[PDB]
C-alpha cells in the first residue's frame, strides 16, 4: 500500500495472509485474501497459477505482521485450491482473476472467529457502489514502487471508485478494462495498492454493511497518474463463488 496508514488486524479481521513453502524449508509471502466463511478464503488466481499445488500454501488469519507472529493468530493448510477456469493473462492484465482456498488446520478445524479473526460479507449480485464512493484497501504490499522490501506491519488506505466509462478511456486503460473489473484510485493519485497487495480486499460499505466489493488484481505502476488500481468485480462472480463453496 502506497501512502495510507499502518493498521492492525482488528481493523480488517477478515484479512488473510497467504504464504508459500519452499523445499529447503523457507516460507515466503505470496498474496492477500479475504475470509468469507470459516473454511473459505477468496483471493486472486494469478497468485497461484505458477505453482498451483495446494500443499504448497499456508494461510494465516489474525496476523498483523508479515514475518513475525501476532498473538492469537491461526495457521492453516490449504485443503483445496480452486482457480477460475476462464483465467487469462495478457501482455497487460489478468481476466477472471479470482480464487478460492478451503482452509483446515493440522487439527482439522476451520477458522475460529475472535477479535482478530472475522468473516466479511459478500455483495449482492450486480450491485456495486456509485462512482466516486470511497472504499478501503489493505495489505502488506510495497510502500513505494522502488522499494525492494515489504512492510512488516499491515497497512490500509482509501481509494475512490472510478466509472467504467472513465477507466476505459485510452488516457487510462482503454479496452483492457472489462465489465468484470472495477477501477479505483486517489483523486491526487497519491495513495494506492502496489506489488504484494494482490488478492487482498477492496471493502466498501454499501448500505449499512462492510462488503467485499473487489479483489486487488492489477495496474500500471503504483499511485501513478491516470493509471488506477484494477480490482476483480466480486458482484459479477457470485454464481461461481456459491457454486464452488457448496461442497
Amino acid at each position: 500500500i502506497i501512502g495510507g496508514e499502518f493498521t492492525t488486524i482488528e481493523n480488517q479481521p477478515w484479512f488473510a495472509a497467504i504464504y508459500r513453502r519452499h523445499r529447503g524449508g523457507s516460507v515466503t509471502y505470496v498474496c492477500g485474501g479475504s475470509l468469507i466463511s470459516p473454511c473459505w478464503v477468496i483471493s486472486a488466481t494469478h497468485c497461484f497459477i505458477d505453482y498451483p499445488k495446494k500443499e504448497d500454501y499456508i494461510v494465516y488469519l489474525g496476523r498483523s505482521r508479515l514475518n513475525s507472529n501476532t498473538q492469537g493468530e491461526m495457521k492453516f493448510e490449504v485443503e483445496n485450491l480452486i482457480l477460475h477456469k476462464d483465467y487469462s493473462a495478457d501482455t497487460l492484465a489478468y481476466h477472471n482473476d479470482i480464487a478460492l482456498l478451503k482452509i483446515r488446520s493440522k487439527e482439522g478445524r476451520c477458522a475460529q472467529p475472535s477479535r482478530t479473526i472475522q468473516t466479511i460479507a459478500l455483495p449482492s449480485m450486480y450491485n456495486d457502489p456509485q462512482f466516486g464512493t470511497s472504499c478501503e484497501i489493505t495489505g502488506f504490499g510495497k510502500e513505494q514502487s522502488t522499494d525492494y522490501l515489504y512492510p512488516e506491519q499491515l497497512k490500509m488506505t482509501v481509494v475512490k471508485l472510478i466509472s467504467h466509462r472513465e477507466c476505459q478511456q485510452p488516457h487510462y486503460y482503454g479496452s483492457e478494462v472489462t465489465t468484470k473489473m472495477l477501477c479505483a484510485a486517489d483523486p491526487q493519485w497519491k495513495t494506492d495498492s502496489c506489488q504484494g497487495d494482490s488478492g487482498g480486499p477492496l471493502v466498501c460499505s454499501l448500505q449499512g454493511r462492510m462488503t467485499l466489493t473487489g479483489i486487488v488484481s492489477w495496474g500500471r505502476g503504483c499511485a501513478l497518474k491516470d493509471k488506477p488500481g484494477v480490482y476483480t468485480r466480486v458482484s459479477h462472480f457470485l454464481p461461481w463463488i456459491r457454486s464452488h463453496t457448496k461442497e
Binding site: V30, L92, G141, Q195, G219
Partner: peptide
C-alpha cells in the same frame, strides 16, 4: 508476467 502485474513474484 503481464506488464501491469502487481504479484509479488513479478
Amino acid at each position: 508476467c503481464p506488464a501491469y502485474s502487481a504479484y509479488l513474484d513479478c
